Amino acid sequence: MKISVSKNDLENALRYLQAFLDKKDASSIASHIHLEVIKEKLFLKASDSDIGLKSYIFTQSSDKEGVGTINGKKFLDIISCLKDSNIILETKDDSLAIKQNKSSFKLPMFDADEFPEFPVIDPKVSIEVNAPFLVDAFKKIAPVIEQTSHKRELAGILMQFDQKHQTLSVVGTDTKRLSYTQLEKISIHSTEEDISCILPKRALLEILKLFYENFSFKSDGMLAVIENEMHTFFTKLIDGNYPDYQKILPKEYISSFTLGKEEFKESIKLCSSLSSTIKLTLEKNNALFESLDSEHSETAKTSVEIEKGLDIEKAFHLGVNAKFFLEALNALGTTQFVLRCNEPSSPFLIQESLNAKISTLMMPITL
Amino acid sequence: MKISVSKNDLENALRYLQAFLDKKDASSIASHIHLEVIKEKLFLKASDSDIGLKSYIFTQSSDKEGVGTINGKKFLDIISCLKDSNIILETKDDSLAIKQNKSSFKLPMFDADEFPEFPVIDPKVSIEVNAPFLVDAFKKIAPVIEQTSHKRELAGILMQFDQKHQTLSVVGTDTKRLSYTQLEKISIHSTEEDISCILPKRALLEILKLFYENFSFKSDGMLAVIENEMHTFFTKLIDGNYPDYQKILPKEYISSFTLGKEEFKESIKLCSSLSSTIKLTLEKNNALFESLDSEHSETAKTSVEIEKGLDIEKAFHLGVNAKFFLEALNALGTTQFVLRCNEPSSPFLIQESLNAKISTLMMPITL
Ligand SMILES: NC(=O)c1ccc(F)c(F)c1
Numbered sequence: 142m143k144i145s146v147s148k149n150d151l152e153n154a155l156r157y158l159q160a161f162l163d164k165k166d167a168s169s170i171a172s173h174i175h176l177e178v179i180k181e182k183l184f185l186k187a188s189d190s191d192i193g194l195k196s197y198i199f200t201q202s203s204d205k206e207g208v209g210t211i212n213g214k215k216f217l218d219i220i221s222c223l224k225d226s227n228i229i230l231e232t233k234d235d236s237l238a239i240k241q242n243k244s245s246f247k248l249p250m251f252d253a254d255e256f257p258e259f260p261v262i263d264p265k266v267s268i269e270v271n272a273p274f275l276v277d278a279f280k281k282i283a284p285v286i287e288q289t290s291h292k293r294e295l296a297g298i299l300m301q302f303d304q305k306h307q308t309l310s311v312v313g314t315d316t317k318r319l320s321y322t323q324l325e326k327i328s329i330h331s332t333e334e335d336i337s338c339i340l341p342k343r344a345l346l347e348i349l350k351l352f353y354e355n356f357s358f359k360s361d362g363m364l365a366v367i368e369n370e371m372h373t374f375f376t377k378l379i380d381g382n383y384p385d386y387q388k389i390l391p392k393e394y395i396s397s398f399t400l401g402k403e404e405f406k407e408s409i410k411l412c413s414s415l416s417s418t419i420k421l422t423l424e425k426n427n428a429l430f431e432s433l434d435s436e437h438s439e440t441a442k443t444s445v446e447i448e449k450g451l452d453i454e455k456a457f458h459l460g461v462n463a464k465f466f467l468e469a470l471n472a473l474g475t476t477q478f479v480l481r482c483n484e485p486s487s488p489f490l491i492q493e494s495l496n497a498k499i500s501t502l503m504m505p506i507t508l
Numbered sequence: 509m510k511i512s513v514s515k516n517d518l519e520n521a522l523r524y525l526q527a528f529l530d531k532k533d534a535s536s537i538a539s540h541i542h543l544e545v546i547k548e549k550l551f552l553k554a555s556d557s558d559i560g561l562k563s564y565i566f567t568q569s570s571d572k573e574g575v576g577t578i579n580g581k582k583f584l585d586i587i588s589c590l591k592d593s594n595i596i597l598e599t600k601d602d603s604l605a606i607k608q609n610k611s612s613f614k615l616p617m618f619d620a621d622e623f624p625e626f627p628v629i630d631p632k633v634s635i636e637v638n639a640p641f642l643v644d645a646f647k648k649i650a651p652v653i654e655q656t657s658h659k660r661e662l663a664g665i666l667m668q669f670d671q672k673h674q675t676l677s678v679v680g681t682d683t684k685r686l687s688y689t690q691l692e693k694i695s696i697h698s699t700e701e702d703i704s705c706i707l708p709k710r711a712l713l714e715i716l717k718l719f720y721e722n723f724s725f726k727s728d729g730m731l732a733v734i735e736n737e738m739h740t741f742f743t744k745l746i747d748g749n750y751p752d753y754q755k756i757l758p759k760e761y762i763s764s765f766t767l768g769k770e771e772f773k774e775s776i777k778l779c780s781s782l783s784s785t786i787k788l789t790l791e792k793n794n795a796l797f798e799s800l801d802s803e804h805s806e807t808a809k810t811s812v813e814i815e816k817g818l819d820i821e822k823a824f825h826l827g828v829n830a831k832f833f834l835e836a837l838n839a840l841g842t843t844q845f846v847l848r849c850n851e852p853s854s855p856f857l858i859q860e861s862l863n864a865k866i867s868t869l870m871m872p873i874t875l
């Protein structure tokens with residue numbers, strides 16, 4: 142109803158909220174942010190059935206407590222064009238006035254009662270995340286997940302909690318490749334020894350913008366609520382049974398090669414100028430790369446020397462998807478990587494030599 | 509047929525050539541760059557009926573002179589993924605081989621005889637441009653020209669040469685606004701005392717990427733050829749008669765106000781958060797800005813103090829298009845601008861206080 146706020150505090154809060162608004166129809170409440178002034182806090186939220194964010198900023202002054210709404214895109218556009226001095230926000234019946242020095246604006250509010258109730262859960266599982274490993278895993282695994290996947294449970298990331306062993310397993314897949322990590326020594330508070338949540342990709346991406354470390358993750362098996370000092374975020378979970386990835390992962394590998402990450406990146410990028418798939422050939426002191434599904438009369442080839450010789454009898458040949466192989470290497474923190482293989486026709490593994498550590502299993506390309 | 513070249517020289521030449529290729533159909537000669545090795549130069553060109561570029565780079569070594577062609581997008585994609593060391597280019601019948609250390613590529617060449625003849629003109633008009641004023645004019649005027657304009661001659665920029673007075677006039681318009689400059693003391697060599705060329709917008713944009721100063725501009729009234737040390741560019745000219753802009757420009761102005769450029773930019777940007785048109789009100793010591801065609805219940809207002817008072821009897825009101833007014837101010841080099849008006853319903857002028865100097869005439873918005 143009446144306050145002053147810091148321009149930068151307000152702008153930053155509004156930026157984050159943009160992604161939770163349906164902006165195209167400005168006449169719908171789904172384009173508005175809900176506003177609430179109580180004590181010395183402005184609360185801003187945007188949500189619906191699926192997903193939502195609640196944020197707050199401190200008022201520089203507060204004169205009048207109450208509630209309202211405002212078009213979030215328009216609000217952000219106005220504040221962005223203002224100077225750093227404090228901004229006065231003030232209702233005038235069903236209109237919000239915005240003032241700074243000689244500049245003043247009016248926007249219409251809607252009925253705040255039309256705004257969805259921001260949900261709260263009775264948590265069945267809860268963790269406190271005090272380090273970046275979880276978001277690191279999220280970031281490294283996200284590229285393998287197809288948001289528009291036509292199968293529902295593969296459109297999100299698996300979080301598998303084992304309370305008994307204090308581990309959080311995180312898994313993404315598109316059916317051609319599967320990336321995973323298991324995070325150790327996580328103090329999990331749960332009503333069950335084993336429990337699984339599937340977060341939608343859309344939610345995953347939002348979390349990467351909002352959180353880094355020092356946040357809680359809580360779930361009742363229907364919603365996941367993530368919270369820190371300034372923000373409360375929620376998303377609906379995805380219903381199905383995520384693939385048994387432990388069954389999918391091979392038992393052992395016939396061969397394991399320790400290889401140069403950046404040299405393989407460069408070599409693959411290079412051959413991928415003319416194709417999407419590549420023929421890798423490994424010899425004792427050499428790795429050869431050749432474009433595979435290139436159009437005829439178009440070829441790309443290169444090789445790198447392997448100084449510390451491989452354990453090979455003549456030559457191992459492997460067809461690979463370039464993008465997938467690169468994204469697997471991109472997920473690694475080490476200067477070297479381990480490539481574990483069985484037959485050239487069976488899935489192969491990429492992982493770090495010896496933050497989360499993300500491994501990727503991958504289907505090869507034939508011939 | 510056989511040479512080595514510097515990677516950076518080759519990459520840079522290829523980047524410029526990209527815009528002269530139809531890249532989507534890789535099976536057509538229109539996706540290829542023509543190649544010619546003679547003396548210690550590789551000549552690269554891409555052209556068609558409308559527009560073209562010829563470039564050259566120096567060979568580090570030359571062994572075999574001749575001609576061929578290559579897909580320009582693919583060539584650029586390959587070279588971009590290579591290291592800085594020299595690159596060997598070498599024909600193998602109707603294929604171009606590209607080699608650097610352990611990396612080698614083949615791409616197919618097409619019949620070089622299918623490539624269009626690069627045109628040459630007998631110039632009717634010629635200038636040497638030894639300073640940036642021309643491209644400065646081009647850059648400042650380009651925003652007012654609609655490339656997809658449904659009327660042909662307004663889809664380009666007018667260049668009007670007066671050999672008698674040694675002036676080059678440059679003019680753009682979209683019918684709502686007209687931006688112009690007249691450049692003085694240009695040594696024009698022409699067969700006529702007065703002559704006009706209309707360059708297409710597409711060509712204008714290319715010229716801005718390729719040229720700055722120390723180039724020749726030549727025309728036969730059908731093509732324009734622009735040339736410097738490394739590059740020869742051409743474009744077809746547009747046929748019609750460009751509007752008589754000297755008739756269009758007003759005789760005198762009832763009032764002329766000297767105003768703050770950045771303050772007006774900020775004020776207009778600010779009000780344009782909620783509208784495309786703005787009501788400007790000028791008073792003796794004040795300028796007020798208000799959103800005009802904003803949706804109802806949405807308002808944006810601001811004002812700035814004018815210390816050195818205006819010559820006004822009460823208040824001058826003027827409806828303006830925000831984007832147009834901003835782009836007019838963006839074209840100015842001065843910290844202040846002059847706004848010249850007659851009736852609030854008639855065209856008004858924006859120009860610099862007291863490089864090219866671009867003035868913009870503009871139709872107002874009513875009420
Ligand atoms: N989920 C699967 O069916 C699958 C099987 C083999 C793979 F290599 C893979 F990446 C995924």
Ligand SMILES: NC(=O)c1ccc(F)c(F)c1
Binds near residue numbers: 681685751
């Ligand atoms: N070319 C025209 O018809 C024209 C007339 C008045 C203007 F203000 C203008 F910018 C253009």
